[PDB]
Design a binder for this molecule. Structure first.
Ligand SMILES: CCCCCCCC/C=C/CCCCCCCC(=O)O[C@@H](COC(=O)CCCCCCCCCCCCCCC)COP(=O)([O-])OCC[N+](C)(C)C
Ligand SMILES: CCCCCCCC/C=C/CCCCCCCC(=O)O[C@@H](COC(=O)CCCCCCCCCCCCCCC)COP(=O)([O-])OCC[N+](C)(C)C
Ligand SMILES: CCCCCCCC/C=C\CCCCCCCC(=O)O[C@@H](COC(=O)CCCCCCCCCCCCCCC)COP(=O)([O-])OCC[N+](C)(C)C
Ligand SMILES: CCCCCCCC/C=C\CCCCCCCC(=O)O[C@@H](COC(=O)CCCCCCCCCCCCCCC)COP(=O)([O-])OCC[N+](C)(C)C
Ligand SMILES: CCCCCCCC/C=C\CCCCCCCC(=O)O[C@@H](COC(=O)CCCCCCCCCCCCCCC)COP(=O)([O-])OCC[N+](C)(C)C
Ligand SMILES: CCCCCCCC/C=C\CCCCCCCC(=O)O[C@@H](COC(=O)CCCCCCCCCCCCCCC)COP(=O)([O-])OCC[N+](C)(C)C
Ligand SMILES: CCCCCCCC/C=C\CCCCCCCC(=O)O[C@@H](COC(=O)CCCCCCCCCCCCCCC)COP(=O)([O-])OCC[N+](C)(C)C
Ligand SMILES: CCCCCCCC/C=C\CCCCCCCC(=O)O[C@@H](COC(=O)CCCCCCCCCCCCCCC)COP(=O)([O-])OCC[N+](C)(C)C
Ligand SMILES: C[C@@H]1CC[C@@]2(OC1)O[C@H]1C[C@H]3[C@@H]4CC=C5C[C@@H](OCCC(CO)CO)CC[C@]5(C)[C@H]4CC[C@]3(C)[C@H]1[C@@H]2C
Ligand SMILES: COc1cccc(NC(=O)/C=C/c2ccc(Cl)cc2)c1
Lengths: 531, 76
């Protein structure tokens, strides 16, 4: 429970540096692993994780005075790159304690900064931020993989002004001319990390992770993706859009001109059949593609059963579109006419999945984001209550009918017409009590047509005033995933033409070598930083 | 790229009036046209347009102290 604890750990937490120096000098080890249940990840349990190391506690506890003392104390100094059972160094652990509150975020960045210089002063050659925990994550990847907007916003924009501690800084100013100054961000382990690039950790993450849609608004990420978009992804996406439009044009005609006389599989007799079956072949191939391309997705992005509809609503429909295509082949060689049933759901999904390609366009893609939110939020709530009413009042109605609408389908079908403006208040005379039939339909109409549909309009308006920004940021994330799924798939061998940035020598290795870094230029202006 | 630049233009931008008065008095022209690519309209390029004239820079750079000095300086 407390397994691994020391009285040194006590003193750091009880605000007692007078006794930390007392315990270390008498030989209290400063590598001790508090590998006890209370000292692990909370996960609901009443705990505090800090890093399973004394130095880690002081960093997560805001005594920078203590922290420095641990590292130049003459009796014994903590190993700066010492990690825990999870593999988390102090900087790793210093991320996992972040919670994206300003009082926390101001501190963690203030502290995270200071262990770096200290480790640089102690060890100009050791690289701390490159260290990886047990899982395979860095402090940068951990911040992005865990939702830590302020830490990430710090690490990327890390401009340090010190003689020996600029090789750690990441946001470099190359030149300046009056109010104009031209910054430089680093892109090391952001676009092409061998393991867990920041982009590939923000985008291939789960909606449980907070602030997925806010992290890409951190500079340079936004500018970086719009650079990949403008350079090579936009052309490929429009091309992907064209092929899918030609696909659906072809699957549409091969469907429209389906044989009607016989049972499948049908015969190549005239020339139009040959030029049609072609389209039918090409129709299936896309389904196989979207099938494999969906299996791929739902393996390498092991989907949380709830996250399917939030993060992956479109992928679900392309996959579902594929399934109806494959069922359409199983049933076309199984001689069953029911291939058409499947085939028509593929078309309808197929054409609606054009809205996928709205994400190459801001105002249309934001609109399609609002659509998928309204579906999952406002419409599902609506249709639930609507069907309770529909089924409630239908049963009532069809129980009153005597004799033909003496069926729960037709009555439910007639009562659904009221909500699409096609309700007859006289669709039956076959009953005994007109007062009942009318009171009941009016109650249905008032509750459903006058109230509930118009309430939905009102609910939607509330939603639109709320998800307006959320939907812009879900849009940019949709486009980000396209940029990443693209640059993988398209190149997948060379990975040299999408190199955002360039070799820009920014400074020097603290030993003295040159500091070459792939860096992203950003041009900026100020009118109050006059110095 | 920098075509037309002078060390006088340097001093105005590097917050240095002590050396603007140094350069003008030794005869540094104060009509010089910085008619170089960096000194034209940005139009996407990473530039700063100010007016292609020394006085114009100081006005667009917020040293009114310098600006007045350019116009009653006795040398030119
Ligand atoms: C458009 C952009 C997409 C791509 C181009 C596609 C171009 C479009 C054309 C292509 C071929 C046209 C056939 C010409 C010769 C036969 C004429 C004929 O009898 O037509 C008849 C049927 O015609 C068909 O059924 C043809 C099948 C059309 C499927 C769409 C093309 C598939 C792609 C592969 C093809 C090659 C393309 C590959 C390169 C991309 C016309 O109808 P009807 O006489 O009334 O017949 C009964 C109608 N009923 C069944 C509804 C009751
Ligand atoms: C190409 C193949 C099909 C023909 C094209 C058809 C679609 C049109 C072309 C699409 C691709 C090529 C266009 C590039 C030039 C700009 C277009 C434009 O006017 O953008 C403007 C309007 O926004 C739109 O016009 C976007 C609407 C289409 C999005 C796809 C949705 C479903 C397609 C179903 C189609 C039926 C398919 C079945 C029949 C073919 C501006 O867009 P924005 O919202 O401000 O976003 C920022 C703009 N930016 C990214 C350029 C900076
Ligand atoms: C603001 C938003 C815009 C909305 C509105 C936009 C405009 C749309 C609205 C209105 C304009 C539409 C005009 C069409 C009029 C109907 C057709 C007609 O009258 O007869 C034609 C129908 O027959 C064929 O077309 C031949 C059948 C085989 C080819 C089928 C694919 C068509 C071409 C590719 C399609 C893919 C798409 C295009 C390429 C990628 C000709 O037939 P016919 O000569 O009388 O006799 C021939 C014998 N037959 C009839 C038995 C076959
Ligand atoms: C004379 C005969 C040929 C006639 C003309 C052929 C052209 C026929 C036209 C359309 C159908 C084309 C083939 C099927 C593809 C389905 C559409 C598709 O997946 O588009 C992808 C575009 O990205 C691509 O990579 C598309 C393929 C590029 C090659 C161009 C088509 C020719 C290949 C076929 C060989 C032809 C030879 C014969 C084949 C029997 C979709 O984009 P995505 O990025 O996957 O994103 C959506 C899905 N996701 C969000 C879930 C990820
Ligand atoms: C059959 C009789 C039932 C009625 C008809 C059934 C048809 C379907 C209709 C309604 C059924 C009831 C579902 C409504 C639930 C509330 C909505 C919700 O939480 O949406 C969530 C997103 O949405 C999702 O995460 C997924 C939504 C789709 C799954 C539910 C419908 C289909 C499966 C169910 C089984 C039935 C399927 C058919 C048969 C198996 C969030 O929405 P919100 O919280 O409003 O957003 C505000 C955000 N806030 C919280 C931060 C403020
Ligand atoms: C979305 C639309 C509305 C709901 C649809 C789902 C309900 C499913 C509906 C019907 C039952 C499911 C099918 C079972 C097998 C067939 C029996 C049958 O259809 O009805 C039987 C009667 O039955 C009734 O009158 C009562 C049946 C409904 C009550 C069960 C709860 C439904 C819960 C969910 C409800 C939503 C709850 C609210 C939302 C949360 C037989 O009737 P018939 O065959 O028509 O008889 C004609 C006689 N003739 C041959 C002489 C002409
Ligand atoms: C929000 C919660 C609400 C709770 C809902 C509870 C639901 C209960 C509601 C109503 C039940 C009470 C009325 C019907 C009783 C059963 C049938 C009956 O006896 O009919 C009689 C007829 O009667 C008439 O023809 C006169 C109609 C009187 C009722 C109209 C106002 C009541 C609804 C006010 C609305 C405001 C409600 C409150 C909101 C302000 C006799 O049978 P008959 O054969 O029809 O007689 C011949 C007539 N015929 C020739 C036309 C056929
Ligand atoms: C929030 C909860 C949801 C709401 C629940 C409650 C909802 C209940 C709603 C409405 C109940 C009231 C309407 C009547 C209902 C039928 C009763 C009946 O038998 O009427 C008889 C009419 O008898 C008359 O004397 C005519 C007067 C009624 C005007 C018709 C209502 C207009 C529709 C809107 C009214 C909205 C008022 C409702 C406002 C709440 C019908 O039989 P008949 O044989 O035609 O009789 C006369 C024929 N003759 C003149 C030719 C001789
Ligand atoms: C992923 C998507 C889910 C929905 C869906 O697409 C895929 O799933 C498909 C499965 C199909 C059924 C499969 C088998 C049969 C048996 C057959 O019985 C006569 C057999 C005859 C020769 O054997 C006499 O023996 C009648 C038709 C029926 C019920 C199909 C109907 C359409 C269905 C429901 C399709 C539907 C559109
Ligand atoms: C980004 O792609 C988007 C965004 C928003 C909505 C949609 N499409 C649907 O909801 C389509 C639904 C549907 C339902 C039944 C049938 Cl038969 C066919 C289609 C796609």
């Amino acid at each position: 429970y407390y397994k691994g604890q020391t009285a040194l750990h006590i003193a750091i937490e009880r605000r007692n540096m007078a006794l930390v120096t007392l315990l270390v000098e008498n030989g209290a080890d400063v590598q001790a692993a508090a590998h006890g249940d209370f000292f692990k990840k909370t996960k609901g349990r009443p705990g505090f994780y800090f890093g399973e190391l004394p130095l880690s506690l002081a960093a997560c506890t805001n005594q920078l005075g203590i922290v420095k003392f641990l590292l130049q104390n003459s009796w014994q100094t903590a190993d700066i790159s010492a990690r825990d059972s999870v593999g988390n160094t102090v900087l790793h652990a210093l991320v996992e304690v972040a919670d994206n509150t300003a009082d926390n975020t101001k501190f963690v960045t203030s502290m995270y900064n200071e262990i770096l210089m200290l480790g640089a002063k102690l060890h100009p050659t050791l690289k701390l931020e490159e260290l990886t925990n047990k899982k395979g994550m860095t402090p940068l990847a951990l911040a992005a993989g865990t939702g830590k907007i302020g830490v990430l916003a710090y690490i990327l924009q890390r401009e340090i002004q010190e003689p020996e501690c600029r090789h750690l800084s990441r946001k470099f100013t190359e030149w300046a001319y009056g109010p104009v100054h031209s910054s430089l961000y680093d892109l090391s382990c952001i676009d092409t990390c061998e393991k867990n690039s920041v982009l590939e950790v923000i985008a291939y993450s789960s909606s449980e992770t907070p602030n997925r849609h806010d992290m890409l608004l951190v500079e340079p990420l936004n500018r970086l993706l719009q650079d990949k978009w403008d350079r090579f992804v936009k052309r490929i996406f429009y091309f992907n859009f064209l092929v899918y439009c030609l696909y659906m044009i072809i699957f549409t005609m091969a469907a429209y001109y389906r044989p009607v006389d016989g049972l499948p599989p049908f015969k190549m007799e005239k020339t139009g059949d040959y030029f049609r079956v072609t389209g039918e072949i090409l129709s299936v191939l896309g389904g196989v593609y979207f099938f494999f391309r969906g299996i791929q997705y739902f393996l390498q992005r092991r989907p949380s059963m709830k996250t399917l509809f939030v993060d992956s609503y479109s992928e679900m429909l392309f996959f579902l579109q594929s399934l109806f295509m494959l069922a359409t082949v199983v049933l076309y060689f199984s001689h069953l006419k029911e291939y058409v049933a499947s085939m028509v759901f593929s078309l309808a999904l197929g054409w609606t999945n054009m809205l996928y390609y709205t994400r190459g366009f801001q105002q249309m893609g934001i609109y399609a984001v609002m659509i998928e939110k309204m579906i999952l939020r406002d419409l599902c709530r609506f249709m639930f209550v609507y069907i309770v009413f529909l089924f409630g009042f239908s049963t009532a109605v069809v129980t009153l009918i005597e004799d033909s609408y003496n069926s729960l389908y037709s009555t439910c079908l007639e009562l659904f017409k009221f909500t699409i403006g096609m309700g007859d208040l006289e669709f039956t005379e076959n009953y005994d009590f007109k007062a009942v039939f009318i009171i009941l339909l009016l109650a249905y109409v008032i509750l459903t047509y006058i109230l509930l549909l118009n309430m939905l309009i009102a609910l939607m308006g509330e939603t639109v005033n709320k998800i307006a920004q959320e939907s812009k940021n879900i849009w940019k994330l949709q486009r980000a995933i396209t940029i990443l799924d693209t640059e993988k798939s398209f190149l997948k061998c060379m990975r040299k033409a999408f190199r955002s940035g360039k070799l820009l020598q920014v400074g020097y290795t603290p030993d003295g070598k040159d500091d070459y870094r792939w860096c992203f230029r950003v041009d900026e202006v100020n009118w109050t930083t006059w110095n």
